[PDB]
């Protein structure tokens, strides 16, 4: 795992996904902090969101554990920061990289999947009253991430 993690680190250091960053927490190569700038095509625009990444012993064959540290209002992300995203579970492969995972999360922020929600009340509002949904998501971005 360590040689793989060092290779990734150097590639994200020289060519990160647009508007993202990632690197070790202190001296521990197996625990990284990442940031995503809120996408301009989302109610998270203007925010900076912190995430935690923990690599398992058998990386890259098992997925990294990725969670939001910054609070966020979204049908697929709960109050513990857990993320419902297929490539972090059933659809992981070692051809994927941390760079690609950050890109995918950016996509999920722009376009939620409300039929597979972690937060039923937010899913209900997303589906029946989108105006109310983006208003509340912008409100949380401004209070917590800006």
């Amino acid at each position: 795992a360590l040689k793989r993690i060092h290779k990734e680190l150097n590639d994200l250091a020289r060519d990160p996904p647009a508007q993202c960053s990632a690197g070790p927490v202190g001296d521990d190569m197996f625990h990284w902090q990442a940031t995503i700038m809120g996408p301009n095509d989302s109610p998270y625009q203007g925010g900076v969101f912190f995430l935690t990444i923990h690599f398992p012993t058998d990386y890259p064959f098992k997925p990294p554990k990725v969670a939001f540290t910054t609070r966020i209002y979204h049908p697929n992300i709960n109050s513990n920061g857990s993320i419902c995203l297929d490539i972090l579970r059933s659809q992981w492969s070692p051809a994927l990289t941390i760079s690609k995972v950050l890109l995918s999360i950016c996509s999920l922020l722009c376009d939620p999947n409300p039929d597979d929600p972690l937060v039923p009340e937010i899913a209900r509002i997303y589906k029946t009253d989108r105006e109310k949904y983006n208003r509340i998501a912008r409100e949380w971005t401004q209070k917590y991430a800006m």
């Binding site: 060092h6 290779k7 939001f68 540290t69 070692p94």
Partner: protein, 110 residues
Amino acid sequence: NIPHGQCVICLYGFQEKEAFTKTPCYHYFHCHCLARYIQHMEQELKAQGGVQCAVCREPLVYDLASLKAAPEPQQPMELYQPSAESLRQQEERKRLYQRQQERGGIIDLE
């Protein structure tokens, strides 16, 4: 000859004297790297109830023992040396994180 691309499992390229292989779906891996991937997937599938290519999901044909016999490639570790610019960027992130804490915007998980 020797392929010009990279092995997506380890992220290193290919050198003469190295042991590597090509799949029927045209993807190159070091033999050692591909053997590790296959072992892991066989274990997962069994716990559920057909190993697919890491790159394109085509079902693979292979002999695991033959892949295992190949020598592991000798690859020097890539040192991590943060540039001056990256160090500057890290400092700015620290300032933003501090504000989020003050707002009650950081999830604790006690």
